[PDB]
Design a protein around this ligand. Structure first.
Ligand SMILES: [Mn+2]
Ligand SMILES: [Mn+2]
Ligand SMILES: [Mn+2]
Ligand SMILES: [Mn+2]
Ligand SMILES: [Mn+2]
Ligand SMILES: [Mn+2]
Ligand SMILES: [Mn+2]
Ligand SMILES: [Mn+2]
Ligand SMILES: [Mn+2]
Ligand SMILES: [Mn+2]
Ligand SMILES: [Mn+2]
Ligand SMILES: [Mn+2]
Lengths: 184, 184, 184, 184, 184, 184
């Protein structure tokens, strides 16, 4: 079983993250951003990962500093759990429909960080969550994990449906890339 | 050491401000606007100034009256600390990058107030802070300090990055203008 | 194990080609076009095929006649190795990301030749290789193998990345079409 | 004196790189790309760095693989020479004129990689050097060094002048960011 | 101390010019064009140069012949004072704000003459001075001094403010280029 | 007989140039750029000049540095051969047709350098010669000779015809300007 963990203390945030690639879908997420916790639970259920996030920070100013630090910690823990990446598929593709929304995700674990972001979120706030942080979350994740990620939206009107369809497609594409190849 | 202070009591706000131009970066800022306190801390760290702000006011209506009165007090304290402005550079230029954002600041301490504002902030709120108050803050500062200030944005998408890059470039351009010229 | 071979002698070129569909990724390619050899190696590694190409020709005039004859020989050897095509999937789909580039390939082995080509290569030369020969290579391959092939580009700026992402997606889509179906 | 070195052996390239930040401008560059060696010499002379590059590779196919591997090695050696980055300016700005060309460079050493590229090179080849590799060189450098880099062109017609003005502005902006701050 | 002088007698003008690069700002300018004398005084004060100009000519026809001959003499005296240009920075950059006006100047002392002029002066006369002579002054200066000069305007409405901001930025950029570099 | 010579040694090029204005058309040109030698021969035959150029340089990088240094040496040798320019026409005009191409050249020897370039060369390479160097050649020639030169194209499609018609018109216009005026 491949397991990654990370702990970082700064002047703004305290974050502890644990990821298990060979899991059954256990989700224990508790940060100061309730909507981000809803998103991280879908990554565990649809990807069959074990995700544990504990974070506290200066949310009285904004959610920006907490959102950025959580994404960096998840990316670092993913890199250490992967190790040498020998015998894995390294490629993942998935399209996820959610009512009127449809998002396609293509990723490859290569060591070269790149993000291709094409999303059109109509509203500025979903709950208390600022929708500009969706791009910032995925940009910080690929900078520490060294992955190439492409996200494209084909349809969608509702802000909740578009974002939560994106996390479903990312979880299942990451699962396919991390499974061992059966060779011939 | 050049030190300026100001104290003003009105029917809406009570403000006390202390500025030291020859400092080491001590920041003690406490008003009713948490995001403005985050911005004023960067002016102390990047500009090597000592900034102390204490303010209370009618924030139950809006942040407008408190934001305006703090900016006027900072400008007045800056003017008294400068004094005769003899032997100083009087000019400052700096461009500050922050991820995808890039802001250039040009200022000159001449006694003639003028503001050139060219910023494109995409969202209406960052946290609880209204983004229309960024222009109002800098307009009130140059009216009491008598400075010529130009702000121009070359790139940027994130609202937090654009504003906080502006304060970094302003702090380092003000620091260069207040240093003593070495002559030949 | 399904193995195909071909040998053709004309007044311009001499070509010998051997293909093994049940392979481990052995690549032995030696023609007069170094960039084409780089492309054919990726088909062996990503598709788990055994590819052997030996060719000599009148490269002092152009690479056109050598490039065309190699593609025809590969298509003929593929057809003979497939045989009756009984019990195979016959369909393959894959999207391959390579930094900023993203290419999708859809193919089906039906006996009816058709090529759908949608690529936008910005430069005229990559090394010494003429970029007009990428279309000519795939058109000659489907004319002798009798396959329906669709290629579409979604993003990309670098000429090397776009072409070499196309060969990766073609290799993995061809591999999926040639595997035996497990039925129920 | 801060010195960084790197050695990487792959199936395509062999690269050894040595960088000294406290140097006098010694340049010893020898790869398979003569135009890149001309560019790396200007970084030593204008930046007062000591740069040593030795590389061999499969240039018979293209210059792509050699150009990419050299840029990655330089970025890694720069990161190790910087160390904790304590007491340095961390910011650099410079505009460099070269006849009709004018390029501005803004950089900051923060640990977050980002590239802003705005160049308009009119021709496809300068000598034997492919002009698409100028972007690929700077993208690979910031991915391993963790720096934020912005490049903007204001004028220029000649391809040689535009590129070689870019390297002059980058060298002097990097020099300013690596000097120790004098504090008060 | 580096000092340059020039004396030229033609059928239209008599000009004597003396320039000292290591000065304290002494200005003694007396030609037949009062507005040009106002401009040359700012070059001495802001650049810390010693400038002495004495000229008489056929101003009853136009100011063209006198303006052209003064600029040629200043450029020649600057070249002789520079000498071998060993140990100097050779590069200068400055942006100067003057109320609503903002002008940026970039120069380099290389021996190759080039002028990049981008100014938008709204009126045809400032006092008795023809505004077409601003371009003619700087073109004649770079032809005799062998310098590369770029001038760009970012804002401005008043003709007096735009021109006199240009001379301020040119003086401080020339001062930076002529100072001795401190090396490491 | 008016004869000019020049010899310059730099770190990149070694150039020796000899020009005779009262000649019979002897051409002895040998540099590392064969197409430039073809152009310089037409200047001797059509202008009745004696031109001798010997140059070696770092052509393994590019032809840029060799092309620039040859043009500077020719311009300097032309200036010294002219001397006081007493009794000469100082003006030259010629239009040269070459099949479908037609180029007009107007020049005047005044001591004030200026280049007016209006050419539309359709291709990027003629042989191994980069077509961007045609402008760079004539710009460097007028900077050292102090001449005013205007070049305008009225028709033409073939790259070889357009360039070689330009050199024919320049040679005959320069010949007319250097002949002694017969007065009344
Ligand atoms: Mn951020
Ligand atoms: Mn939901
Ligand atoms: Mn107000
Ligand atoms: Mn912040
Ligand atoms: Mn053909
Ligand atoms: Mn490759
Ligand atoms: Mn690459
Ligand atoms: Mn060069
Ligand atoms: Mn004139
Ligand atoms: Mn004035
Ligand atoms: Mn040049
Ligand atoms: Mn010819």
């Amino acid at each position: 079983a491949r397991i990654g963990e990370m702990k970082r203390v700064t002047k703004e945030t305290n974050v502890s993250v644990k990821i298990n690639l060979d899991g059954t879908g256990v989700a224990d997420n508790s940060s100061g951003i309730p909507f981000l916790d809803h998103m991280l639970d879908q990554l565990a259920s649809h990807g069959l990962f074990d995700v544990h996030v504990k974070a506290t920070g200066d949310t009285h100013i904004d959610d920006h500093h907490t959102n950025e630090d959580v994404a960096l910690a998840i990316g670092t823990a993913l890199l250490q759990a992967l190790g040498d990446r020998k015998g894995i598929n390294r490629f993942g593709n998935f399209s996820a429909p959610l009512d009127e929304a449809l998002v396609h995700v293509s990723l490859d674990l290569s060591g070269r960080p790149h993000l291709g972001y094409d999303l059109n979120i109509p509203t500025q706030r979903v709950g208390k969550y600022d929708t500009q942080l969706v791009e910032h979350f995925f940009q910080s994740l690929v900078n520490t994990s060294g992955m190439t990620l492409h996200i494209r939206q084909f349809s969608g009107t509702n802000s909740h449906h578009i974002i939560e369809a994106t996390f479903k497609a990312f979880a299942r594409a990451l699962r396919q890339a991390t499974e061992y190849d059966t060779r011939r």
